[PDB]
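Q: Got a minute? One more chain.
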Amino acid sequence: QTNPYKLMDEAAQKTFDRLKNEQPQIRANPDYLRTIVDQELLPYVQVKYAGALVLGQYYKSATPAQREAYFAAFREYLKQAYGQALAMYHGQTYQIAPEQPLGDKTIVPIRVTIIDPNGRPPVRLDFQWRKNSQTGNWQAYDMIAEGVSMITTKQNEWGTLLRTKGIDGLTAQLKSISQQKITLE
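A: Always. Here it is, folded:
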């Protein structure tokens, strides 16, 4: 399947299936959550498009080798960070927005609501899907989470680091963060 609603449905279903049913494996090795991210989610993420946007002005002035190193570190960072997000699983489930015709739409926002029955209030995610012009595949290049863009958030969080130490500095920080072990609550 190739339609971005169907990709959302599949990725959600598979991820929650493994979270629901493989807690022994996750408790035994929390880093297994990085594998779930790597297999079920990351292939559908437009990592370089997002990463370039996070860099902003610093992307244009970076060399190809700097860019390569940055994108590698950024990908590893995403595995760690969203692995750590999956570590917050405690029986939540999800509802995805219903499929709508694609038409000639170029960027398709697809909402998923993370529901915690009898627990915490809903968490609204809005994935920004577009067609990768090179690969021909639909991918998400950003996620709005609780009303905050992940790209924008990271621009803000890493702004001073970029202003003072540039893409080299950010690459080193991403690599550092990606090496932190995932922890369960």
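A: The chain has eight helices and five strands.
Q: Perfect, thanks.
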